[PDB]
């Protein structure tokens, strides 16, 4: 008597799986048939059992997930696996037991079958291009069968820390390469080792904002940084300078318009006008920006949305945002212009750049499936086309998509203020620091704690 087990294979969590073990001699003859499973590492695992009484138990682990059957016909014992999860990965075998016709009992195996539940989960900001990253993982599932799913959680800078150190997390994370020195440190990113020609695809300044330590924790996509949108209808000739909105902000609110909304609550938006000048600098430029609420030129709680919807909608004539944010202004009936970000005390507007960077978590099981996505199939003209359509990108990482990106003004205008500004130091210390910007503007602005004592607080 031999037991053939059927039916392993690869499957994305939440879908199923018919195991099948067929004996050659009749299953009245066994007593019990069951299902045990063995996970690399670890002791053998009964999951489903039934003896010839039809009698059925289940380990609590997939008790109400999975059906032990059986049928006498075929001498066939079926175990259908439905909504799979990542712990269910294991080699399966089949297992009969026998009474002899004396006292003693037959215990018999099978070669076992191996079952793999696996799932690419990407992390990605809402802002950005998650549909667009999910057709190019659904041509990776078509190429290999992996499932490619794209979430984009709130504050997923500061819940990834906490969830890939502890729990699972994702397999790839996505963000402005500034918090991923905080993570290196940590030890939550696992080295990336790129071969020469697929590292020679890319811009060498780019693959520097994604080295800490002397070593590269991430893959860059794209350069991002602020621009000035504004609305060519209600202005033509927009402001140079920062000093002069609250003039036309005059004239915009006699004919029932804004002159300028933009996320004030997140401290990336407003650190452009802090930074203009430089300390004496902050204090100028902060106190400006304190001055504009105090004259009701703006709201004290503007947010990404309402500021976003304004411009939309074409209640403000302009808005400071990214790259991300144009796909949505092409979809209303707004024609719109990108442009240098405006000067303050005769100097630019810094704002500070990012590199989108798509980092591998150390504690992933899949480190190489995601570096074939990342490299082969992302991170390919093709690739960065399908995110770019969806959100645009910005400025690529790509050395062969120079010719598409010189094409577009808006391009242009992100180049522009991005050389005005400067790229972020990817430091440990850049969490604790964006914080201690985040409550200051935000105390400020809301009129809780004096522009001196903002900076005294901060510095610390
Ligand atoms: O607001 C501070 C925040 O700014 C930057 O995050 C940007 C991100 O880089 C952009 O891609 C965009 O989506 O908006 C974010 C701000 O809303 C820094 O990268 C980040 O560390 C910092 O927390």
């Known amino acids: 008597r031999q037991l053939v087990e059927s039916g392993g294979g690869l499957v994305q969590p939440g879908g199923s799986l018919r195991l099948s073990c067929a004996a050659s001699?009749?299953?009245?003859?066994?007593?019990?048939m069951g299902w045990y499973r063995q996970a690399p590492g670890k002791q053998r695992e009964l999951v489903a059992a039934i003896t010839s009484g039809d009698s059925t138990n289940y380990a609590d682990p997939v008790k109400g997930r999975f059906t032990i059957s059986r049928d006498n016909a075929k001498n066939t014992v079926y175990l259908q696996m439905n909504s799979l999860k990542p712990e269910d990965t294991a080699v399966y075998y089949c297992?009969?037991?026998?009474?002899?016709?004396?006292?003693?009992?037959?215990?018999?195996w099978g070669q076992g079958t191996p079952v793999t539940v696996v799932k690419l989960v990407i992390w990605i900001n809402g802002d950005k291009g998650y549909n667009g990253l999910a057709e190019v993982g659904k041509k990776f599932e078509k190429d290999t069968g992996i499932k490619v799913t794209v979430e984009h959680p709130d504050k997923l800078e500061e819940k990834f820390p906490q969830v890939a150190a502890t729990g699972d997390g994702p397999d790839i994370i996505f963000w402005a390469h500034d918090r991923f020195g905080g993570y290196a440190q940590s030890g939550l990113l696992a080295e990336i080792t790129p071969d020469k020609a697929f590292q020679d695809k890319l811009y060498p300044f780019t693959w520097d904002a994604v080295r800490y330590n002397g070593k590269l924790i991430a893959y860059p996509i794209a350069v991002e940084a602020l621009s000035l949108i504004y609305n060519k209808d209600l202005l033509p000739n927009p402001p140079k300078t920062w000093e002069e909105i609250p003039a036309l902000d005059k004239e915009l609110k006699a004919k029932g318009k804004s002159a300028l909304m933009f996320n004030l609550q997140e401290p990336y938006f407003t650190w452009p006008l802090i930074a203009a000048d430089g300390n004496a600098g902050a204090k100028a430029g902060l106190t400006f920006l304190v001055d504009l609420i105090k004259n009701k030129h703006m709201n004290a709680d503007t947010d990404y949305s309402i500021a976003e919807a304004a411009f939309n909608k074409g209640e403000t004539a302009m808005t400071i945002n990214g790259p991300w944010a144009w796909s949505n202004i092409d979809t209303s009936k707004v024609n719109y212009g990108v442009t240098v970000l405006p000067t303050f005390k005769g100097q630019p507007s810094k704002p500070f750049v990012g590199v989108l960077s798509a980092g591998i978590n150390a504690a992933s099981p899949n480190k190489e499936l995601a570096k074939e996505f990342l490299e082969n199939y992302l991170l390919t003209d093709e690739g960065l086309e399908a995110v770019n359509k969806d959100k645009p990108l910005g400025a690529v990482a790509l050395k062969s998509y120079e010719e598409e990106l010189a094409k577009d003004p808006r391009i242009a205008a992100t180049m522009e203020n991005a050389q005005k500004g400067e790229i972020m130091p990817n430091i440990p210390q850049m969490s604790a620091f964006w914080y201690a910007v985040r409550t200051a503007v935000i105390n400020a602005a809301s009129g809780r704690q004096t522009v001196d004592e903002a900076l005294k607080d901060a510095q610390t």
């Open positions: 001699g009749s299953i009245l003859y066994f007593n019990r």
């Open positions: 297992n009969a037991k026998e009474k002899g016709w004396s006292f003693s009992l037959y215990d018999y």
